[model samples]
Target: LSPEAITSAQVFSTQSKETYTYVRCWYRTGNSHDESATDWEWAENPDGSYFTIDGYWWSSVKNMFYTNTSQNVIKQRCEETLGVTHDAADITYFAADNRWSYNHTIWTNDPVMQADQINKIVAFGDSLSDTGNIFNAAQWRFPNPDTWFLGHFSNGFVWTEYIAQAKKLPLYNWAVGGAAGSNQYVALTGVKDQVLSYLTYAKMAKNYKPENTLFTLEFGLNDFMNYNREVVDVKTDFSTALIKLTDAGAKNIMLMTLPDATKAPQFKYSTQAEIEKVRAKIVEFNEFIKAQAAFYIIQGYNITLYDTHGLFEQLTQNPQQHGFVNASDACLNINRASSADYLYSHSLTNECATHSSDKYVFWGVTHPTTAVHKYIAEKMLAPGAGMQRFNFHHHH
Candidate 1:
């Protein structure tokens, strides 16, 4: 079995000269009553038969550690001897083979594209994808207007920013706030309109290669907001936009579905029945999106859909499990006293630092906090999100 495969307490021997790295260590200073602070450290020990006051240590060529005593005692020794601070919950132990592992630091996965594979990323969507490309500081509802990201709605980074960072590529975001997927646009740029702009820019650019470029399309929240729009019409507009991108020699497209708007704090004042009605509409819109994705897949286009709607639902259903304290309330709300209830409209009064945007899922009624954006990006980049590199073939 793999060294990392061990979950409970177990014992094993490692080949000589093997090494295993531990991320965290914690130790109490002086005697138990010293009142001094506990010291923390990190260590990477080579595989060898070693004995310490804590327990006997062994390892394999693969750098897996094995201990005879409880994994907690090994952790204690790591802190006591190595002076490292590790959370008990972050440590995993294997009883079947005496293997133990602990997480000291967090890390993100590699980008979906290779270094030279993707040159630029062009994003099209609504406020969620908007990065202040066209909006003024006053138009955004962030606490630090002067220092905030130029056109984004969130207090900090959004999903698109995270994607750009992971991929290490330049981003040309054409998303506009309040942009709808339907032709009935609230702004000069809707989902369809953004695609047209992208085509124009790609044609005029000096170095524009569709095969080496990535296109991200995210919209439909605004269409759902507008009750006059039908689900079929939204899907048709979205599908038409996808066909246009493929026709323009685009091979890589990442699409995102709409989340349940009724669950947002903006609707806190509305009746439960009214909220349910809105939620039903959101579900209807999301179903259409999923079906459209299937239709596109059948057509064999390099299209990947990130189910933001499902992810939001899962997070809302189990906020604590996902490291979120509150999912129902916004980080900014004036009517409620809870930090999560603070309103974005009262941004000046309730600063982002004061409310702790990281703990709350939603920043405002319609937008998410930077923490949520990070989570969304992680999910999309995860192995199971269906984001796989494909051979470039523009079959339009």
Candidate 2:
């Protein structure tokens, strides 16, 4: 795989039992033989997030990410797709005589963990991780600070705030509600923008130890809830956003997957079949996030795929174990005049809610109650049955 222009197709080979995964390719123009100096373009770069000369490979999966494969499959894939003729050496780097085709992997990257003891945290997501961004972004109108605790979507501190409080670490919460995984949808402020906002702050007055900062991302529900927004968009956006963060000195990355949003009381009246379809999409979105973690591990980023989806599933199935007496219904009924007034005015009345949120899982339509948020933080901090602290240790 020398950095030279080839005249014919060259089949590449590797160890027989080696691990196979995504192939990220980067094509830089205006460079003939000087890889020592060239700026590579990010196929999905977020504005305001600076990046060094790097490469992200693409796979035949047609997504911006890679498809996991073994040797034999890839051996024939060149012929199956690229129509290789008598190719050998495992993978064939075919340099088409006309187009600018190139391969930059048999990926030999490793997962290098740096932030063993996280000192600071920077978060980006929807209401799940939003402390006050969404409320402020909405001009303090929606969610009504009265019902939601102190600018949170929940009744009290969100999960990240709880963890940071316990660990004695400061937090930079840039998450906003209704944020899709990417800016591909529209002019909405997606998680990409959240990262950009952080990056913009970091280089100036804000400072953080790149190796000791815990960067967390909890998104995708907004994307999938928008009518089949394509889980690939979430995953692709994740890869790009994460690349930008790492390029800017983020080391420890924690990726949060989405729960089954269709299980919310808002979707309670929907057809069972319809709910299941959305549930399937939620599961796929989580899987995409999980796969992205694997891709980053190859590039030596310490990644934690926080199992938000798994924990929520358990809470719903075994609510009693989680101290949730009413897991299926939302505690706050905005449709009720009394409830609306109480939520909007902070009236202390028992009539506004069926449950006092101590045993209720949800506070409003889809946001989890602070009780659930506390439980989430507990599982994340302790060695419990949650997907938090599920570390991806490096081999070396």
Candidate 3:
């Protein structure tokens, strides 16, 4: 494709001299060209009454507006919907919406872990990686705190906990709810380093041993939320972070793809078509990770790829069979009017009563239910389950 002006509009109209107006314009190009007349145009009206760009109108399954292909469109929409510009310095980019939910803590009653094991593991990422988010909105609202419990409410039986418990591995959980991969720490008094940096010193440095350390990194949800100018770089940044960890003695690494945000309740406000577009971008991201894993494998690292999308799809196809009602959502609450309310009325309990130990499952957001945690742990313990060789040498 080449850059070419798809639409044009005037900067102003003589009809309104007292008021300022910019013409609204739209353009489509056949190929990728960053700086060409065919690539750029004014987003204003011919009369210049106002400069209003309708992104929804520019939506497409492919070759659509950049916003359509990136989460930047979501941020732009939020700005337009709330009539406020997001201040990155003051506000955390993707703070949880904290909407109402019905299911309380039927599963978090005994959230803390008791057993100890070998091969200390450090699990770090945003809210999805943090189990405490299930109970403490304060942490979910603000994740840069010095300390937060790993088992609280929905986070009690998070996958990492089960994995560590089953393997008898000492787990140093450093998951922080509501964080973007671009920056670490909460709003005020927080370092802007990579989120994983915190765990490197606090947990891994103390526990990691070469050829024995296991690291699980899950991010991108928040990254996808405020992708504005830094969206495309997330995958690269993630790969860089992984390389740093590999250099730092991380023998085994588990990488999970971003769940389908299009399917999550957080984006229920989006139209079906828009959700599909987001799904398409997510697919692109997944492909990037898979490719990166192949590249990293050549470097002599052991990488495990967790298909959050595939797992979610299974849940969707058999919610009752999987002991879940909605595949894309946690068993928490259905913010949508049409979905069933699965969240407990109380927010403090542990383990949903399973119809079958193999079936019943529940967890907050896109996380695994306690039962799901057990299932994943069982698989991880299986011979050569998620593990794969990168390569004997660093480069492929």
Candidate 4:
């Protein structure tokens, strides 16, 4: 079993040594604290029990449900209830929730590509990666404000929308909210599977090969929660994943550090001491990610590391100058209420006037406003702006 850290970076770097490298894939948890466990636990038996619910997947051994006999008996009684199947080594639990059931489904932004078009770039990550692009109509009600949304919006910045607009590139975003690097544990899309799916999609859709494609992956926030793990173990898992990308013909790859989760609005509920601990772990994870990028460079693969955490720190500290009223929050919380409503409802403010002065912060718990995303995107787009050089042009 892995030890738990308050932050993702800490748990990732603190884990025991492992053969494979790991990626952060932090977005899987979002800001929901209900059941976010950022560690690894061994399955009691070689064959593990797995189930899916509401489009999310979860697994554990019978021991994982020793107390929940009624549920287990119900599962056993209804063999087909949770998509159940029998395996010699373990039992396959099915998903009864419409949200989590594992379906062999694939979605692509571009069904086909023309040969005359420029090279395609696939940006993979979470909501931050989505840049306010709505995946389903359910999210479309928010009025899709590309700018002037709230904190974390660097000139309406999220990296993907910013990069695509600046480079004039057609970007296919494959990021899902609340996703993580570890699929089985986090129950969101794993980095490896997403990359594989993207590559396969490109090959099948446009007859494009890996060499001609540029894949950018940003994760680490998730890994930080497990920072207690050994650095070598984390490094190994991450590197192995990158190597797999290389093997699959990913020519250009970019990595980014998880934004400073410790400093994000959600951390407001935490004490200063807790925030400091998370900050320390995040710094260490940044170093590891930088080192990983260097290793990949030495091996001759084209890769870039964007230091999003550092960037956000700079932005938040100087929000007003950057044209954002709030640097730490968005325009609305999960309740879809105005900041005033949120502050007053939560007793964060006594009057609207007081809350007005508190501008330049997030309206919600996790996501930044559109304004913040835009500004950050612009800064990131500038030459030598991200963690490292943005352009990795190759010559034959």
Predicted structure 3, TM vs. truth: 0.53
lDDT of 4 by residue, 76-99 (tens): 433432222322111112212233
Better of 2 and 4 by lDDT: 2
Model 2 spans with C-alpha error above 4 angstroms: 1-117, 179-187, 226-228, 335-355, 384-396
- For candidate 2, give the lDDT: 0.55
Worst 10 residues of 1 by lDDT: 88-97
Residue 312, model 1: lDDT of: 90
Candidates 2 and 3 compared: the better one by TM-score is 2
Q: Worst ten-residue run, lDDT, model 3?
A: 102-111
CA shift of 5, model 4, Å: 38
Clashes of 4: 76
**CA-lDDT, candidates in order:** 0.55, 0.55, 0.42, 0.44
User: So what's the TM-score on candidate 1?
Assistant: 0.61
Q: What ranking emerges by TM-score with the best candidate at the front?
A: 2, 1, 4, 3
- Candidate 2: minimum summed lDDT over ten consecutive residues — where? 30-39
Error of 1 at 351 (Å): 11
**What's the lDDT for residue 186 in model 3?**
43
Per-model TM values vs. the true structure: 0.61, 0.62, 0.53, 0.54
* Selected candidate, larger lDDT, 2 vs 3: 2
